[PDB]
Structure formats: structure tokens, C-alpha cells
Amino acid sequence: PEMVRGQVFDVGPRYTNLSYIGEGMVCSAYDNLNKVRVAIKKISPFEHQTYCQRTLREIKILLRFRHENIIGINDIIRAPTIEQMKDVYIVQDLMETDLYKLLKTQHLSNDHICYFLYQILRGLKYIHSANVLHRDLKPSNLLLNTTCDLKICDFGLARVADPDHDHTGFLTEYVATRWYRAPEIMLNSKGYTKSIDIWSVGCILAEMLSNRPIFPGKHYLDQLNHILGILGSPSQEDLNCIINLKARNYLLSLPHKNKVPWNRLFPNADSKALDLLDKMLTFNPHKRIEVEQALAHPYLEQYYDPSDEPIAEAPFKFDMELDDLPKEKLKELIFEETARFQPGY
């Protein structure tokens, strides 16, 4: 089996000419069947409950979804038996770069900002129409090819939406990337509603406009005070929406802060972009714009066409009952979920 800078990366015979991309391990390879270079991620999850869950979740979701702005799975390579299966390789379209890498060194034209935002929201419309929440949208999970076609990846933290069960106490621990978390996560929300993805997209828009994250909190509660430093103190009405006393009293304890106008923070931005930014970064999740409304905002008029913004054929009605499932059953489900890619299936 071919080796790569360290370890076994065993994806032959179909894929050859491997080149390390990064850290399981990612390489590009030449696809001898389709005659194109592809991306291959090696995953070794079976020791650990939590990796089994994230890998299963991602595979089941990406296999069901079919949308131009969500990364597909082209192929999955694994041993023919559950006993021999130690690693799984996932094959996907090779993408030139991602929005994290691009923002580190490239300034974006207003036209690029608008087109990228349009594609993020078009993919998100489809994801939310399947009653799924991504929950970890951030620049590194937005892949871009050489012609700036954008695809959302990494559904390891995604869940089926469950708004009746979203309430929780103050300071409840959370798993998704801190700088893109909506303020209610720190106050009273489990992140089981579609509004927590819109907040992340708003933070992504802000980051496109300036190349710097807008709320770069250094720890759990710091993230909330970054948010409030910009949006200012929440209104009476918005506090009245938070019934939990620990969370509301914490907000009441803070000195009053006024709003920093978006046009002072982003003095080169298109005014329509800032109007839509303001609606995505709205403190109260019930007042926050939804994905279809965002698509219809004037900033996106050059692109909006709801007949070309497709939705999923069927909801993911169940949440994958993966939380309390042993790794042995999980390995078995992964083996079954990947079966369709075995030779002469």
C-alpha cells in the first residue's frame, strides 16, 4: 500500500499520484476512472464513540444531500468486512482552497462577497429545508474551487432541528467553533433552531468585509461580551424574551453599551450588505432573518431566483439516535452506510 509522509494511505488501485494536503490525513490523488484529481480524507474513528458518531452523521447526511453548494461524497473506500475495516477513506471533488485560507491573504471584491454570500445561503436553504442544522458554519467549512464555486462541508456537528427542546440554563457547555456562536448559546439555547446557523453566516459576512473575525472571543463568556460590545445592550423586549433568571440577570448586571454602527466598522462596505448583515446579526433569534428572506434581500438581487434555489425532497424527520449508541453498533452502521461503494454492488 502507498505511504504518505508517515502512514498508510491505501486507496489504490483507482487513485494514484498522492500529494499530502494536511491534517485524519488529507491528500489529493488522481482518479484513474474519471481522469481528474480528487481529494481523499483518511478517517480512523472506530476507537472512540464521539468520532464514530461524527463520521456516521457526516456520511449519512452527505449521502442523502445532493446540491451544487454542498460537498458530495464521490466514493468511499474501506475493507470488505467489518473485521478488516480499520480506516475509511472519503473521496470528494478537489477544491482549490477554502474561505479561511483565502481570507488570510486575499481581499475580496464586493462582487465576490455578494456571490459567496449568495452561494452560502443557497446551500443553507437546502440544508434547512431538510430540517437539518449545520451548527458549525465558519470560513474553513466553505470550500472554493478555481472558479469560485462554493461548497459547504463538515456536517460532523449537524443535528435535526428541534425547536421545542432548545431551552437550557445559562453557561451550558457547547461544542461548535466559538467565534461563530450566536449569543443565545451562552444564555439559554442548545443550538437546535435554524437561527443559530444564520448568526454564523452573519459572522462570515462580517469577516468577508474586513478579513478579520468580527467576534474573536478568547473563551466561553468572552464571546458574549464581544457580541455585546458591538450590538450594544439588548432591549427590554429582547431581555423579556429570556425567562431564565441566571441568564437575564447576568445581562442586567452589565453596564449599558451603545450599538457600534456597522458603517463605522465597515466603512468600505456596500450599504445593502450592511443592512443584510444587521438582520443576520440580530440579538433576538426570533427576530433574526431566515435563510429564504435573506436570499430575497436587495443585496442579493443579482442572483436571487427561488426557482433555482432547490430544497430537499424529504425531511430528515428523526434525529439520528446516535447519542447513546455504542461504538460497536456505530461501526456496523458506518459499514452499512458505505456499502453502496463496494465493487459490483
Side-chain angles (χ1 to χ4, degrees), residues 104-115:
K104 274 189 312 183
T105 59
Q106 305 293 328
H107 143 98
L108 273 44
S109 75
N110 180 231
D111 289 323
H112 282 85
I113 298 173
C114 190
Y115 186 42

Side-chain angles (χ1 to χ4, degrees), residues 172-211 213-263 265-287:
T172 295
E173 287 317 305
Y174 196 61
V175 285
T177 318
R178 186 184 307 112
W179 295 350
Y180 302 90
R181 284 170 190 171
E184 60 275 14
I185 297 295
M186 285 77 74
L187 298 169
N188 71 167
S189 177
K190 298 181 199 167
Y192 292 176
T193 158
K194 288 176 184 172
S195 59
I196 57 105
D197 280 335
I198 292 292
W199 177 264
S200 305
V201 174
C203 286
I204 292 161
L205 175 61
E207 193 163 348
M208 291 196 289
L209 291 169
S210 67
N211 295 79
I214 184 183
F215 305 126
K218 312 210 220 269
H219 42 89
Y220 184 101
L221 203 46
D222 191 42
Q223 187 53 34
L224 181 69
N225 281 260
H226 273 266
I227 300 162
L228 305 177
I230 283 166
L231 267 57
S233 298
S235 76
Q236 181 156 69
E237 175 166 290
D238 287 348
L239 283 181
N240 290 159
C241 301
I242 296 167
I243 192 168
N244 182 277
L245 265 169
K246 290 197 155 177
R248 177 194 308 189
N249 274 346
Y250 171 71
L251 296 171
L252 290 174
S253 72
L254 299 174
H256 180 232
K257 302 158 229 236
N258 282 302
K259 177 155 201 70
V260 179
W262 297 116
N263 69 160
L265 273 168
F266 307 108
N268 299 305
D270 182 307
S271 59
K272 292 182 191 178
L274 293 188
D275 185 70
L276 177 56
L277 179 64
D278 179 64
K279 293 168 154 69
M280 301 178 161
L281 296 184
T282 278
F283 178 85
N284 183 333
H286 304 290
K287 293 181 175 169

